[PDB]
Amino acid sequence: CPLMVKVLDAVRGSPAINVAVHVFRKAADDTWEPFASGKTSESGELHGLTTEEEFVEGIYKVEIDTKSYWKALGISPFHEHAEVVFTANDSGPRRYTIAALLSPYSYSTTAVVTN
Amino acid sequence: CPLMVKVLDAVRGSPAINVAVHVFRKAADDTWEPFASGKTSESGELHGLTTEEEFVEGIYKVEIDTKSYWKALGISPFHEHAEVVFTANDSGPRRYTIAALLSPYSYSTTAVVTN
Amino acid sequence: CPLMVKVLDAVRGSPAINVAVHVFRKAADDTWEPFASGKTSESGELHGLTTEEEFVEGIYKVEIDTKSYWKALGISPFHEHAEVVFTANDSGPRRYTIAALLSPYSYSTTAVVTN
Amino acid sequence: CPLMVKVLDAVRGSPAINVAVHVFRKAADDTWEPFASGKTSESGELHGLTTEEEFVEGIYKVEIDTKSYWKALGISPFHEHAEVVFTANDSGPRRYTIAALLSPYSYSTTAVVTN
Ligand SMILES: O=C(O)c1ccccc1Nc1cc(Cl)c(OCCCCCCCCCCCOc2c(Cl)cc(Nc3ccccc3C(=O)O)cc2Cl)c(Cl)c1
């Protein structure tokens, strides 16, 4: 699995469960063609987004639907979504975890890149 | 001043100086229209992007060009940029400060919204 | 002003107001001695803790009383407080800003150090 | 395993490997008696710190030796260590993960608490 997503909730100290995640890749014509998506699991994780064959170098965007998550808990949020835009770079063996930590008015994201 | 941006560098413990910042506003046809842009000052701040008149309700995207910054420091970062997308002014006019904290493989963003 | 503290609330998107802050300095016998204390203002800032004279080289601990803050908001947070421990002034006198970003189950802290 | 620690490196986008972690518990006489410790693994994790029998309600401190980590990479850091102080609360089934994300001049910590 070359690309995983992991989301945490800073208010509840828990995985952020049932969070919608969309991944896009920059296309020839500079358009963000949908690439993959899913909903975080009970552990706050989303695996199986893509395969190594499909996950070529390129610019990618991972959009995390944070606004719907906070609405489902009844907490007024600032952002429409959290967005993580990065270039995948095919330098030998590499797996990518995009982690996000959510609060109503803040978020952090980190990339954990391993061989 | 209703929209300010503040950038910090988590590696040097300093303001993130001369960082490019572009603001877009979502238009009628779900296209992102250029709204305002500038560069952070020596204090890592960017003021005077807009006016209370011009800064109507809408969905805004504040794109902070973090890759060019880290590059200029001789570091190949993970992200292309930090992007913060939010509805503004939807319960009336407010003053928004968008803060970002930058590392090569991570960033954090918070909004401070006042009367 | 060589030591300032800035607190933000990631849940309300506001400064974290009236937050208690205690500073200690490590003494000769590896005991923490009371150095200075105060509460954040309406802007979430705490200035005038010390003077350039009094603020000598040493190991300092800035304890931010985050539990009492979240309690006063009706939230039972994870942490007892945020604690930031650092050597100060060890390459000469500097100006230190300790920023913290608070959620119930998470916090972030950064130092901005200038001439 | 009732208490785990996980540390990430924001500069390198990697687990923070071989990082010293000490856990202390507040003692009768308000002293921080060493409770457990170890070094993060290749995955940035530390498990097996304590057992459910031993991990009673109480105030705990998890000290992460961030300064030695940054020194081993040759990057000047601000903090002496990252410290996470919290009360363990014995409310039914609960496991605690203390996650920390490190940069030279900043860190974030989060508690992920599951049943
Ligand atoms: O990944 C697993 O496996 C994992 C598994 C399990 C758990 C976790 C796991 N992973 C995981 C763990 C964690 Cl902890 C994570 O957490 C990362 C969190 C990083 C957050 C840091 C944000 C700090 C922002 C402070 C900015 C302050 O700026 C300001 C300043 Cl300095 C001054 C002023 N005032 C002024 C003064 C003067 C003039 C104008 C202003 C003016 O107003 O601008 C205003 C501002 Cl706003 C993540 Cl992402 C992933």
Q: What is the CATH number of the domain that holds C3?
A: 2.60.40.180
Query: Residue A26's beta-bridge partner residues?
Result: A32
* Domain span at C93: 1-115
Which residue in B99, B101, B113 is closest to C14 by CB distance? B113
Reference B8, options C100, A37, A45, C81; nearest CA is C100
Q: How many domains does chain B have?
A: 1
How many CB atoms lie under 10 A from the CB of residue D79? 24
| B42 C-beta neighbours (distance < 10 Å), count | 10
Between CA D106 and CA C104, with CA C43 as vertex, the angle to 5 degrees is 55
- Distance (angstroms) between ligand 1 centre and the Cα of A114 equals 24
Q: Report the candidate in B3, B97, B95, B93 with the shortest Cα–Cα distance to residue B56.
A: B93
**Residue B14: closest CA among D24, C3, C110:** C110
Nearest-angstrom CA–CA distance, B95 and B115: 6
One-letter identity of residue A111: A
Please give the structure tokens belonging to residue A39: 């909903």
Q: Is D79 within 8 Å of D19 (Cβ atoms)?
A: no
Q: Side chain identity at D65, as an amino acid letter?
A: D
CA distance A99 to D10: 11
D35 Cβ contact list (under 8 Å, min separation 6)? D23, D24, D25, D50, D60
How far apart are the CA of D13 and the centre of ligand 1, in A? Answer: 16
What's the distance, Cα to Cα, between the start and end of chain A in Å?
12
Q: Write the CB contacts of A12 (distance below 8 Å, at least 6 apart in sequence).
A: A73, C104, C105
Compute CA distances B21 → B48, B62, B110, C38, whole Å: 12, 7, 15, 35
Interacting residues of B31 by C-beta distance below 8 A, sequence separation 6+? none
Q: How many CB atoms lie within 10 A of CB C13?
A: 23
* Residue B54, number of CB atoms within 10 A of its CB: 12
Which ligand 1 atom sits nearest the alpha carbon of residue C106? 14
State the residue for tokens 């039972």. Answer: C76
Q: Which of the residues A102, A114, A115 would you substitute to probe the D interface, choosing the one with the greatest number of D C-beta atoms within 10 Å?
A: A114
**Pairing relationship of beta strands B20-26 and C45-46 according to DSSP bridges:** unpaired
Are D95 and B2 in contact by the 8 Å Cβ rule? The answer is no
Cα B88 to its chain centre, rounded Å, is 14
Torsion of CA D10, D12, D18, D21, to 10 degrees: -10
Contacts of B100 (CB under 8 A, 6+ apart): B5, B6, B7, B8, B16, B64, B66, B82, B84, B107, B108, B109, B110
Entry resolution (Å): 1.9
Measure Cα distances from A39 to A10, A47, A60, A107, C39 in Å: 18, 10, 18, 18, 42
Tokens of A112: 């954990």
Dihedral sign from CA coordinates of C26, C27, C31, C36: negative
Cα–Cα distance measured from residue D100 to residue D84, given in angstroms and rounded to the nearest whole number: 9
Eight-state DSSP code of residue C92: B
Q: Smallest Cα–Cα separation from B59: which of B99, B29, B79, B16?
A: B29
Q: What is the DSSP letter of D44?
A: S
Q: Report the amino acid identity of residue C59.
A: I
Distance of CA D109 to the CA centre of its chain: 9
Positive/negative CA dihedral, A32, B98, A107, A99: positive
Count of all residues that appear for chain A in the document: 115
Q: Report strand pairing: A106-114 vs B79-88.
A: unpaired
Q: What is the DSSP string of A7-64?
A: EEETTTTEE--S-EEEEEEE-TTS-EEEEEEEE--TTSEE--S--TTT--SEEEEEEE
Question: Quick one: tokens of A64?
Answer: 């995390």
B14 lines ligand 1 (CB under 6 A): no
Q: Which residues pair with B111 in a beta bridge?
A: B98
Strands B3-9, B95-103: parallel, antiparallel or unpaired by DSSP? Answer: parallel
Question: Do C25 and C32 meet the contact criterion of CB atoms below 8 Å apart?
Answer: yes
The vertex-A92 CA angle with A91 and A96, nearest 5°, equals 75
Residue whose tokens read 């001369």: B18
Residue B113: half-sphere exposure toward Cβ, Cα within 13 Å: 22
Tokens 């607190």 identify what position?
Answer: C7
Q: CA separation (Å) from B55 to B35, B58, B86, B88, B90?
A: 9, 8, 13, 8, 11
What are the backbone angles phi and psi of residue B15, rounded to the nearest 5°? Answer: -60, 150
| A78, B99 Cβ separation under 8 angstroms | no
Identify residue A99 by its one-letter amino acid code: A
Least Cα distance to D23 among D65, D70, D79, D76 occurs for: D65
* Residue of A13, A16, A12, A1 lying closest to A99 (CA atoms): A16
Cα of D50 vs centre of ligand 1, distance in Å, is 30
* Single-letter amino acid, residue D66: T
The neighbours of chain C, by the rule of 3 or more Cβ pairs under 8 Å, are: A, B, D
CB A98 within 8 A of CB A4: yes
Joined together, the tokens standing for residue B100 give 């970002």
Q: Which residue of C lies nearest to D96 if distances are taken between CA atoms?
A: C78
Please name the amino acid found at residue C43.
S
Tokens coding D103 = 């940069």
One-letter identity of residue A34: P
Cβ burial B84-112 (10 Å sphere, 16+ → b, else e): bbbbbeeeeebebbbbbbbbbbbbbbbbb
Place of tokens 């807009």: B50
Q: Tell me the one-letter amino acid at A46.
A: L
